[PDB]
Amino acid sequence: MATLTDRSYFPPLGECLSGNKIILSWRLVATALEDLACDRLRSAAVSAFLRDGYVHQLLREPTKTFAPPTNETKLDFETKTGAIDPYNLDTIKDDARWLSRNVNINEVAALRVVIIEYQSRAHSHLTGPLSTQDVANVQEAAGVGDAQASAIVALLNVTTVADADSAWADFESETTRRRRLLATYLSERRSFLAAVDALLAFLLHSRAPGTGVELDPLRNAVLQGAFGFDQNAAKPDTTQLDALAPTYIRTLEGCFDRMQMAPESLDNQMLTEQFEVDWIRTALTEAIHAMSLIFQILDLKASQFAAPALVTQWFALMDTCEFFEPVPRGHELIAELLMPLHSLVAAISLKLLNVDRTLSYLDQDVDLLEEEEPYLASSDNLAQMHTTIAAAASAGLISTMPVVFAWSLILHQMHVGYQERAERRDLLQNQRAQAGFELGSIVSIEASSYDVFLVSQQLERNIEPAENMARIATGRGQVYELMADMAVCLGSGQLAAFRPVLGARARLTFQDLLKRSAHYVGYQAEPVSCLLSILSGGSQYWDISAEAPSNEKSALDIYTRMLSDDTLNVQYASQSRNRFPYEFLPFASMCRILSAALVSDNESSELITGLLVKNPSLTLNWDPRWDRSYELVFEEENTNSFRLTKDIDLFDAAPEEKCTISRGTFGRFVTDVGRVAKLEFEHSTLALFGKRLEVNLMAGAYDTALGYLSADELIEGISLLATVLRAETLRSSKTDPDRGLRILTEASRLLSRGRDIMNVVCDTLDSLVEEELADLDGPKTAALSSCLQFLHAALPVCPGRVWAYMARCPLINTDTRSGRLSRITANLDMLAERYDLLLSAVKLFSSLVDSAKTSAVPWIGASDKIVSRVTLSIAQTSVDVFENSATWRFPSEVDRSVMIRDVVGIMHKLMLYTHSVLTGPLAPAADYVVESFLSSSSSSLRFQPLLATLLAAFQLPDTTIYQRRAQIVSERLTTVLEFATILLRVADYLNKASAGIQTQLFKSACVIARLPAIRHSFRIPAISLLSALVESAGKSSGEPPSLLGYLGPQVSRSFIQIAAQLDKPFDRVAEVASTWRFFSTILRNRQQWMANCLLT
């Protein structure tokens, strides 16, 4: 009746051991809730799991899940297994009781883990180290006289030593099985908290962009069932959701304890080096996902004081855990979790301090809501929080510097409030003094709710401690650089650790700190730069999207607040405009960042674009040759106000294309330390920059009042142009197109000779690259990126112009006699700006071949002739890059993964689009790629990057954060695998090749077949490839190479098992079809050994 049953979460043992019921482990549940995940969340298994009342109890009270053993659970453990070929019930029983004793969980929970391990042994086999023979195969597939070094470092890391026969002897041992049990347990712990975190993100974010987002029935079902939250109710009860925060805060003390010691109840020599890392990694991961949850809950009541009990609970925790700073940090797995952990710690602390509402409340400038109560109301609260934050500031714990900084402001404001009331009181004391010395009431001070705390620390008469905290944090504490890093971590770029939604709401705390510190700090280089970083969040031009972070409206607050918030807008945003273009970077950076981020919000985009087109002022260096073209308007003694008596032209010859500012326009000099003037001249920033751009080309044929724009201003200015063009493009409709068109002509509204901004950027591009033919300069190399990005953005609005220019674009046009300039200029080195340049080219090339597919359905500059040489050069360059990537040194492996995915993608699209455009315009390009890979003159060297992807994928860390990193490696793998399949097909299709490329894939089959046990998204592309391999071998005139032969007996048994386990867990139609395709081709292509293995 009342007692919620365990049976749905833990099926009867018999149905598990048989294979009927596959237990939904937390790992699978977690994967079903991953950032991409959508289809998996629909499946009946997961739907039932999330709708289970028993599961709901674990969600509210996480200590239940792996709760300590009791006689109540010992009893259930006997009952659970008194219901029942030997899978050895006694071995399973032995293990469950061993596990329960070693990590001190209850026998039922241990039994759950034991079965999970048992039902995933096939996966365990494949994730183990390769056999020695397998390594020999990879080595031979690589086979280079020099580039085997990069192959060697990869093989060394794949972990190598095994004779397959004894590997099974190891695997079956009692020791090895129980290490797997510990690892399965640690895996389940990580996944449990990851699941809870991801579940809340799923519930609290309606209208997410998943597949068929009427996942609302599931959302509503869980909300009402687990948290009593009825959205359709009059006033929804949130007390249960709220209760999650104090609950999960409690779990954090545990994570911190475990992070310091393994349970002294665990058998020795389970304690390998591998186990210690896994143990620590789990504790940290649990901490990170709990904190993510806590934040989501706090953010439910944002713009409002948290409950004081919540505020003090958190800071008491930070006190006992020393702000989560002392952690054992040896391995890399542990290392990449530190920044995310610290980011959440800072953000949560800031969220709870709520520096913005706190300062406003102290100035009696805010009215509390019904049940709102600030922690400031109590001196006792403040006393506890103070010593904690002060201790962090004294120890110089780096990650806590934002908290120290925010607190120093709060302290100062309390001190000011006290001094004000003290003077107000001492004034009355002196009025009554005066009236008394003519020819008895001892007037006291106005009472505050924080005074007795102030006195206890002497902060009422001595504010030096607060000043010093700010000094520590801005100085040696490097809080500005620190927040910039946390903003990348909490960003929306490829290095981001968290969901964009969470990150966007968290970065908000950092922005509030800068909003308030601007009162004490001016408009200085550091806070400004930091603010730009917090806004940027590590994004770039390629990340620009037509949609908001998970379609969330409030996720864009951090961006929209730059407009709507009086302090940020006046102190930062409008402040940057008031000094543009005299100071170019900040204003230009900010418009680029905001417009890129605000694409989905029309009212915000119009305000930013409108400002660029209708800009009220202009700030520049005063030309001393204008000392008679102005009269002082008056007051004070004015270095300030003046009025232009004559007209002044910003641009002079040595034409009606000039920038003149009519007389009467008012101005103001802005330094007295220099000669800078702010002119109230309304104008178009874009139109102006376009003309500045044009002047820079003519090399002294013009005069500029604005000066020659430098390399940095060249980079920033074009990127802004690119971004704004791109943004306006994505906002355009079929009822309102030509938005990008308008932006192009608005920027071309001031040029000469019937010339466009298009021509200016293209001429800039060509001129730059002859200047960049010197090749030593990064800033110029970066400017090349911007030109390419503009060209990319310009492609959708005027395709023909871009194609027409690419024909003469010196970067590629190998053309007449190998005039390939991008290759020479990029190859020289492969770091920093060079990578960005090469990426921009690749990305632009990819859009070009995309343009040919939609051209087969304004366009005037595109002819078959031109499209053929352009795409041929692209193919030529793509192959060159792809091949060279083997030896190159990229900034990071994530960066390499982007490069490889996009370069291989280009070549894949060339072969795939050749038939839908007689040879055909894409034919020579497609032929170039085909001939490049089929010729064994270099095929034995042109396979290495393919294998590198294979091994990179095989070594993707097991993490539930850094999902964007995992999506990217997955896209690199998938793209390479699918490219390999198209190669095999085309090779068979024209009967050439077969030979080496097919052979190399067989040599690589040992790695390929292990992929499906690394990630779900790997499964279908890997299997699909092996099927294409088997089908190709069946088309060879002799007897096809045995696939079972290469993989070995045991690996094959495990692989085939998984192809059946592929069908099972989520019931996806696609998974079933790939197993069917694989088995069908095995049975039809003379792989008898594999065929028989299929049935055993």
Numbering used by the authors: 1 to 84, 92 to 446, 460 to 674, 683 to 885, 903 to 962, 971 to 1149
Quote the original article.
Nucleocytoplasmic transport across the nuclear envelope is controlled and facilitated by nuclear pore complexes (NPCs), very large, modular protein assemblies. The Nic96 complex organizes four architectural proteins, Nic96, Nup157/170, Nup188, and Nup192, as well as the more disordered protein Nup53/59. Moreover, we can show that both Nup188 and Nup192 specifically bind to FG-repeats and translocate across NPCs by facilitated diffusion.
Nup188N crystallized in space group C21 with one copy per asymmetric unit. Nup188N is built from 52 stacked helices. They fold into a large right-handed superhelical ring that resembles a lock washer. Between helix α32 and α33, we find a β-stranded insertion with structural homology to Src-homology (SH3) domains. The Nup188N ring structure is closed by four helices (α10–α13) from subdomain I that latch onto a complementary surface created by helices α44, α46 and α47. In contrast to canonical SH3 domains, the SH3-like domain in Nup188 has a different β-strand topology, which represents a circular permutation. The most regular part of Nup188N is subdomain III, which was found to be structurally similar to nuclear transport receptors (NTRs).
